[PDB]
């Protein structure tokens, strides 16, 4: 996962499509281009 990198636990998640840390705000805000309800829920929602 993410080549061993540990991402920010609240602000980020390890996106395994890219194996990079990606911002939670982006995936959770339904006004963004990369909003993803499922990934927000799974990877971000409970940590904030």
Numbering used by the authors: 34 to 81
Task: Please give the exact wording used by the authors of the publication that reports this structure.
The Drosophila tumour necrosis factor (TNF) ligand-receptor system consists of a unique ligand, Eiger (Egr), and two receptors, Grindelwald (Grnd) and Wengen (Wgn), and therefore provides a simple system for exploring the interplay between ligand and receptors, and the requirement for Grnd and Wgn in TNF/Egr-mediated processes. Here, we report the crystallographic structure of the extracellular domain (ECD) of Grnd in complex with Egr, a high-affinity hetero-hexameric assembly reminiscent of human TNF:TNFR complexes. Here we show that trimeric Egr ligands assemble in hetero-hexamers with both Grnd and Wgn, with Grnd displaying nanomolar binding affinity for Egr, which is 3-orders of magnitude higher than that for Wgn. Altogether, our data provide insight into ligand-mediated activation of Grnd and suggest that distinct affinities of TNF ligands for their receptors promote different and non-redundant cellular functions.
To uncover the organizational principles of the Grnd:Egr interaction, we first determined the crystallographic structure of the extracellular portion of Grnd. Therefore, we further trimmed its boundaries by limited proteolysis with trypsin to a shorter fragment, which was assigned by mass spectrometry to Grnd30–81. The proteolytically defined Grnd30–81 readily yielded crystals diffracting to 0.92 Å resolution. The structure was solved by S-SAD, and refined to a Rfree of 0.16 and good stereochemistry. The final model includes residues 34–81 of Grnd, which we will refer to as Grnd-ECD hereon. The structure of Grnd-ECD consists of an N-terminal β-hairpin followed by two C-terminal antiparallel α-helices, with the 8 cysteines engaged in four disulfide bonds, with a topology that is reminiscent of the CRD fold seen in structurally known TNFRs. The C-terminus of the Grnd-CRD folds in a C2 helix-loop-helix module, organized in a nested pattern of disulfide bridges, according to the consensus sequence Cys57-x3-Cys61-x6-x5-Cys73-x3-Cys77 (where x is any given amino acids, and the subscript n indicates the number of residues). Although X2 and C2 modules are common features of TNFRs, Grnd-ECD is the first example of a TNFR fold combining the two together, with the side-chain of Phe46 fitting in between the two. A major finding of our structural characterization is that, in spite of the poor sequence homology, the ECD of Grnd adopts a cysteine-rich domain fold consisting of a X2 β-hairpin followed by a helical C2 module, in a combination that has not been observed in TNFR domains so far. The reciprocal orientation of the Grnd X2-C2 modules resembles that observed in single CRDs of human TNFRs such as TACI, BCMA and Fn14 and the fourth CRD of TNFR1, with the conserved Phe46Grnd side-chain packing between the two.
